[PDB]
Design a protein around this ligand. Structure first.
Ligand SMILES: Cc1cc2nc3c(=O)[nH]c(=O)nc-3n(C[C@H](O)[C@H](O)[C@H](O)COP(=O)(O)O)c2cc1C
Length: 122
């Protein structure tokens, strides 16, 4: 479950990060809201085109942390706010995830995240 404020930050431009737990250390990678997609049941998706260690890390462990933010709403670090979130990841080359990310031309997979809980931080 997520606050309305989460969605409103996704609606805007910002950077996001995804800490993919695997085994040989979690890999806190980056992405842009302009590349992400939200689904119902608060499921979110990231287009994986070159998140390699993250591919191995999801394949070993579903555990992921996700930091999102925007440059259009003021937080603590400069005029940019965001949240720390947790969920289970799953790579898919199928579903409304892969369809709604198909709009890109460099996606190798839809890194689907089944978010569970958020807290506002930055
Ligand atoms: C700001 C930023 C956004 C990025 N966005 C994406 C993205 O949405 N999808 C992607 O596959 N690669 C993206 N990358 C490139 C790499 O995937 C990213 O650097 C990642 O850490 C590499 O992780 P890996 O060791 O698992 O390959 C992005 C890199 C940066 C710095």
């Amino acid at each position: 479950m997520l606050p309305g404020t989460f969605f409103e930050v996704l609606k805007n431009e910002g950077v996001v990060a995804i800490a993919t737990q695997g085994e040989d250390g979690p890999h806190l990678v980056n992405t842009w809201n302009s590349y992400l997609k939200v689904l119902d049941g608060n499921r979110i998706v990231v287009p994986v085109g070159g998140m390699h260690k993250t591919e191995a890390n999801v394949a070993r462990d579903e555990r992921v942390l996700m930091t999102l933010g925007s440059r259009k709403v003021a937080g603590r670090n400069g005029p940019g706010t965001g949240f720390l979130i947790r969920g289970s990841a799953a790579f898919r080359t199928d579903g409304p995830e892969f369809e709604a990310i198909a709009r890109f031309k460099w996606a190798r997979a839809a890194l689907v995240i089944t978010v569970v809980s958020a807290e506002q931080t930055l």
